């Protein structure tokens, strides 16, 4: 019984996925570069700050044992 259940459902289901997948905004250059920018800038901030703080403080702290 169940294999049939699942097969029927899968067919119904996939067709609804396809509908959604046209609504979902198509990525193109402009959009891409937009995200990429803001994104990278952010990750840079967070990233830099941890390097400058961790690494130097560890060479100090570590040799104080």
């Amino acid at each position: 019984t169940d294999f049939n259940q699942k097969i029927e459902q899968l067919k119904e289901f996939i067709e609804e996925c396809r509908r959604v997948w046209l609504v979902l905004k198509k990525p193109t250059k402009d959009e891409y570069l937009a995200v990429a920018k803001v994104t990278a800038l952010g990750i840079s901030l967070l990233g830099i700050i941890g390097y400058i703080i961790h690494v130097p403080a560890t060479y100090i702290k570590g040799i104080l044992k």
Binding site: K61, G62, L64, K65
Partner: protein, 32 residues
Amino acid sequence: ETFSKIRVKPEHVIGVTVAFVIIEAILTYGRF
């Protein structure tokens, strides 16, 4: 948040951690 009537001010929470830091930062390295 919940229906707790017990609450504390961020300055303390902040301060408890800067404590812990100072403590082990000298208790461990050097054993001051």
